[PDB]
């Protein structure tokens, strides 16, 4: 049975070199082209190129010529993809695939057997704890039942952050959203809680934020505006 | 020459026939062989069709494809929950006179599992704390929508704002509906120089908005 087994996930700093691998089984490694395919977060599959291990021939897609190097080790039946200087924009899932099909006696034309993918994450950011800002209750005497309030957890690295409200005493109505990753490399997230409009006259609201990589624990009171 | 264009998304209910399209040029789809791939969460892309209309070994016969001039189409009859995921056309492109492989943009197929649900949208203005620190961030929080595709537009007074906008991909919540968030970063002078800003969220053809003002 044909299988291509790719190397494990990578987490790198921008500028660093990296070589990822795709080791093949169940067929003559020298005799088939291998392709590489990139998928950037939220985006589609993009062909990068093909490499022929039998004689080291290669063909790169225009966007990729000179930006990445394909190669192969015939002693181990492994194909490789290498960058000398990773950029944040190289953050993607990378697949290798055999070009095959065997529809005719000879030749190849379809990517038939695929590796499981290698995730590569590249950051230029450094460990950094967030700033926390109150997101105050908009309006303060409504006729529509409830009010939403929250905390903005701004500019931290790396993931994750944990957010609780009233030290976990407030769990109902809470929605902590997945972080946005900004082009700076820093993450921001928001947590919102829906509460009865009437309870702004009694109940104190404190979002508790912990970023463990920076050893950062912040307690922010969120109260209506003036 | 070297692009395949597909619709970004399609949906249907279990048992329907649906069709995925792909537009090419004379460099690819018209004269060279076209292929189709399924891409499901947690698995590698899987060849469904090769050489224009040949179904791959082991793929069920509810999958079929055709090609007419610079257009190609993948049909799925008898749609199943299991079919939800991304579908790509691909072709050989000979514009540089060699074998270049091109994938289409991909169509995300949702097989409608639950009733449609409109997003809840909450918009917060910059805090006074953040303004005191000479920054300003608008936060637009979008939750509980299904299917899981939305478009977000911001406006300054009546005018489109493109720059300073960062929006997440939508992620599936505990309840199988989706959430997203959009942040608009401004200078405090920019925030206070406008009468208002809005976050406009479009889901299945309906737009809803929320507005904030410095006051």
């Amino acid at each position: 049975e044909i299988q291509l087994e790719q190397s494990g996930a990578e987490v790198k700093k921008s500028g660093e070199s990296l070589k990822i691998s795709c080791q093949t089984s169940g067929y003559s490694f020298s005799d088939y082209w291998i392709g590489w395919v990139r998928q950037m977060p939220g985006k589609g599959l993009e062909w990068m190129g093909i490499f022929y291990p039998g004689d080291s021939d290669s063909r790169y897609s225009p966007s990729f010529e000179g930006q990445v190097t394909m190669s192969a080790d015939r002693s181990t039946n492994t194909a490789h993809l290498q960058w000398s200087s990773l950029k944040p924009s190289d953050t993607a899932l990378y697949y290798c695939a055999r070009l095959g099909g065997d529809y005719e006696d000879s030749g190849a034309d379809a990517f038939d057997f695929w590796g499981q993918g290698t995730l590569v994450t590249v950051s230029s950011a450094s460990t950094k704890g967030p700033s926390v800002f109150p997101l105050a209750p908009s309006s303060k005497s409504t006729s529509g039942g409830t009010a939403a309030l929250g905390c903005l957890v701004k500019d931290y690295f790396p993931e994750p952050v944990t957010v609780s409200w009233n030290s976990g005493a407030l769990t109902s109505g809470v929605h902590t959203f997945p972080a946005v990753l900004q082009s700076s490399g820093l993450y921001s997230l928001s947590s919102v809680v829906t509460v009865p409009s009437s309870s702004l006259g009694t109940q104190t609201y404190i979002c508790n934020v912990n970023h463990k990589p920076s050893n950062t624990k912040v307690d922010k009171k969120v109260e209506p505006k003036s | 020459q070297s692009v395949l264009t597909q619709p970004p998304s399609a949906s249907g209910t279990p048992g329907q026939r649906i069709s995925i399209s792909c537009s090419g040029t004379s460099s690819n789809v018209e004269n060279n062989y076209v292929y189709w791939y399924q891409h499901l969460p947690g698995t590698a892309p899987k060849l469904l069709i090769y050489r224009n209309d040949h179904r791959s070994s082991g793929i069920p016969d509810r999958f079929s494809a055709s090609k007419s001039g610079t257009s190609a189409s993948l049909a799925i009859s008898g749609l199943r929950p299991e079919d939800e995921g991304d579908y790509y056309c691909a072709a050989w492109d000979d514009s540089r006179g060699g074998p270049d492989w091109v994938f289409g943009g991909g169509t995300k197929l949702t097989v409608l599992a639950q009733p449609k649900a409109a997003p809840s949208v909450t918009l917060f203005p910059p805090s006074s704390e953040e303004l005191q620190a000479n920054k300003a961030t608008l936060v637009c929080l979008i939750s509980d929508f299904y299917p899981g595709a939305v478009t977000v537009a911001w406006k300054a007074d009546s005018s489109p704002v493109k720059a300073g906008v960062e929006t997440t991909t939508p992620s599936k919540q505990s309840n199988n509906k989706y959430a997203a968030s959009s942040y608009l970063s401004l200078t405090p002078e920019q925030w206070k120089s406008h009468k208002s800003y809005s976050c406009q969220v479009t889901h299945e053809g309906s737009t809803v908005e929320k507005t904030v003002a410095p006051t």
């Binding site: 005799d31 000879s106 030749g107 | 004269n31 060279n32 062989y33 050989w92």
Partner: peptide, 16 residues
Amino acid sequence: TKKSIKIRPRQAFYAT
């Protein structure tokens, strides 16, 4: 071989 890449009928790159 399998080196040859056939993009359409009766055609091949890397033909031996």
